[PDB]
Paper text:
Nucleotide [name], the modification site of [name], is located in the hairpin loop of helix 72 (H72) at the 5′ boundary of domain V in 23S [name]. The [name] structure consists of a discontinuous MTase domain (residues 1–46 and 99–280), interrupted by a helical subdomain (HS, residues 47–98).
The location of the inserted subdomain is novel among AdoMet-dependent MTases. In the open form, motif X does not approach the active site, and instead is stabilized by interactions with strand β2 (R47 and Q49) and helix α5 (residues D123–E130).
Numbering used by the authors: 2 to 280
The structure:
């Protein structure tokens, strides 16, 4: 099968999501003991950029394109950008890695991957990406159900990355319920949830519901390319991290101003790091 095309891959949201994922993975690697990378909605593995037609078009033009060849790239972005460069060795943007391939190139020999994807184009492509990589288990199954089935890991260490559908009200609720079930089984796991800002009120409710679980130690990192609106698509996105590694808050405070300056040259929107639930 041919690699999956995507119009959104490598956009400002992916830049934020993958900056955070890489920093968490690098922290987990500071202990020589094994850990698990669990991706509930793993997608195809990699995406072709630029569209199937002759013109080079896609949101990557306002995302990864604006940072990957900067000479003053912050040190916190090196691990991530080096993965992107690996899939684009000619020096032209043609492919963008999904979270599973970020994980594949950053994890060590002793670490494990557990990946789920239901889509009939994406799943077979994902399986092909991990042929003969025995560290990975790739299944065509419901993502949220893995938080019950696969936690806690035998290693008792891990990053759980949740990058779910947000198409209806029940989608936003499924996120909080799933996290609660995982946390019940694996309270010391690091949970990283990506969310879009299309309607702020849905996000407010989601965060309210998350606070209500009683879960502590919840960090929020958000980057907005525009001010909230009712009449745009996605104006912003963020990462909510439960049990963030010791350095993450500091690392993000260090890189967000640079990231926002490069991703949003007009200076609109905002970039924030704060705690939803302290402690």
């Amino acid at each position: 099968l041919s690699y999956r095309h995507s119009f959104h891959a490598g956009n400002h949201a992916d830049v934020l999501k993958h900056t955070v994922q890489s920093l968490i993975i690098e922290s987990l690697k500071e202990k020589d003991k094994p850990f698990l990378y669990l991706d509930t909605h793993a997608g195809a593995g990699r995406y072709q950029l630029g569209s199937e037609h002759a013109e080079r078009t896609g949101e990557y033009l306002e995302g990864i394109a604006r940072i990957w060849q900067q000479d003053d790239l912050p040190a916190e972005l090196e691990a991530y950008i080096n993965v992107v460069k690996h899939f684009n060795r000619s020096g032209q943007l043609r492919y963008y890695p999904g979270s599973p391939l970020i994980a594949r190139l950053l994890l060590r020999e002793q670490d494990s991957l557990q990946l789920t994807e239901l889509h009939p184009s994406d799943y077979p492509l994902l399986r092909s990406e991990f042929q003969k990589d025995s560290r990975a288990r790739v299944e065509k199954a419901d993502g949220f159900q893995q938080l019950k089935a696969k936690l806690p890991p035998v290693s008792r260490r891990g990053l759980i990355l949740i990058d779910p559908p947000y198409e209806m009200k029940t989608d936003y609720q499924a996120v909080v319920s799933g996290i609660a079930e995982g946390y019940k089984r694996f309270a010391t796991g690091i949970y990283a949830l990506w969310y879009p800002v299309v309607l702020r009120q849905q996000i407010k409710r989601m965060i309210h519901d998350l606070e209500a679980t009683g879960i502590r130690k919840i960090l929020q990192i958000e980057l907005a390319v525009l001010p909230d609106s009712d009449r745009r698509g996605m104006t912003a996105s963020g990462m909510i991290v439960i049990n963030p590694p010791w350095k993450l808050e500091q690392q993000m405070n260090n890189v967000l101003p640079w990231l926002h300056s490069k991703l949003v040259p007009a200076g609109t929107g905002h970039a924030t790091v704060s705690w939803i639930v302290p402690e």
